[PDB]
């Protein structure tokens, strides 16, 4: 189990969007990997709700 998406996710106000990461078995490090490509394919359907995870990625890469 990974608690470190949960966090990730809940800190940019996606907590909605944790039902399609859990059945996904997607990890933080995993995640970090995912383009606007692979998250739609997953089902995170609106451009802004992918760009916000995105940048999420960049700035938690960036603020490291």
Same mark, same amino acid.
């Given at each position: 189990?990974?608690? !470190?998406?949960?966090?990730f996710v809940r800190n940019l106000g996606?907590?909605?969007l944790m039902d399609i990461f859990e059945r996904?078995?997607?990890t933080l490090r995993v995640?970090?990997?995912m383009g606007h490509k692979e998250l739609k394919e997953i089902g995170i359907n609106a451009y802004g709700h992918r760009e916000k995870?995105?940048? %999420?990625?960049?700035?938690?890469? !960036? %603020?490291?």
């Open positions: 189990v990974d608690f !470190s998406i949960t966090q996606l907590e909605h996904e078995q997607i995640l970090v990997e995870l995105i940048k %999420g990625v960049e700035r938690l890469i !960036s %603020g490291q």
